[PDB]
């Protein structure tokens, strides 16, 4: 008989779908062949990036006394982190707003 | 009674990661769409960088090291090194398992 089916994500200890990433790589016109470890590695990298952004967005939501992530929290998380801001520098987040930043010269002379 | 077509998305995996990093925290539909678009964009960036890396070296296979070099090229510093560490750990665990 055949062995019980185990997902490649479970073997890799990842939450992102290794099989779906592998299928997308094969059918994405990227290369003639795709190695076995490439989908695992890419799923791990995507999961880590998602974890970073989601953790920062959850911190922002908790700061805003909210228990649900909205686009504003994602924008705050991305723009408050230097490396994430550099990674998504040319990316616009819908309904994200802008960070509070008023130049000092415009402030009243108190 | 026409069932809508199957549209694949990373929503369930993003939800699992969110529950891992923040158990008592939710995510709206717009935020989920934004996260899905972010995952798709990063996937496209890394895959294209790996494809041009393979083409430059006259190779026909995208391997783990091509993806690693793409991550090192595209990510800003500490993000890159932590992503490389996570990827190598996942690949090592997968190879060790089967």
């Amino acid at each position: 008989t055949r062995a019980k089916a185990k997902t490649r994500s479970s073997r890799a200890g990842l939450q992102f779908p290794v099989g779906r990433v592998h299928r997308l790589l094969r059918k994405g016109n990227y290369a003639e062949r795709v190695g076995a470890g490439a989908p695992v590695y890419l799923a791990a990298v995507l999961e880590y990036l998602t974890a970073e952004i989601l953790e920062l967005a959850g911190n922002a939501a908790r700061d805003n006394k909210k228990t649900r992530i909205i686009p504003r929290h994602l924008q705050l998380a991305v723009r408050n982190d230097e490396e994430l801001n550099k990674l998504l520098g040319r990316v616009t987040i819908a309904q994200g707003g802008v960070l509070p930043n008023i130049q000092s010269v415009l402030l009243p002379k108190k | 009674k026409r069932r809508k077509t199957r549209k694949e998305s990373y929503a369930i995996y993003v939800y699992k990661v969110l529950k891992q990093v923040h158990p008592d925290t939710g995510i709206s539909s717009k935020a989920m769409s934004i996260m899905n678009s972010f995952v798709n964009d990063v996937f496209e960036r890394i895959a294209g960088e790996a494809s041009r890396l393979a083409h430059y070296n006259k190779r026909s296979t995208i391997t783990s090291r091509e993806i690693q070099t793409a991550v090192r090229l595209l990510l800003p510093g500490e993000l890159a090194k932590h992503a490389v560490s996570e990827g190598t750990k996942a690949v090592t665990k997968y190879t060790s398992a089967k």
Binding site: A51 | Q20, V21, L79, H82
Partner: peptide
């Protein structure tokens, strides 16, 4: 349940 070493 999950923490990242980047934020210490």
């Amino acid at each position: 349940s999950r923490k990242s070493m980047r934020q210490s």
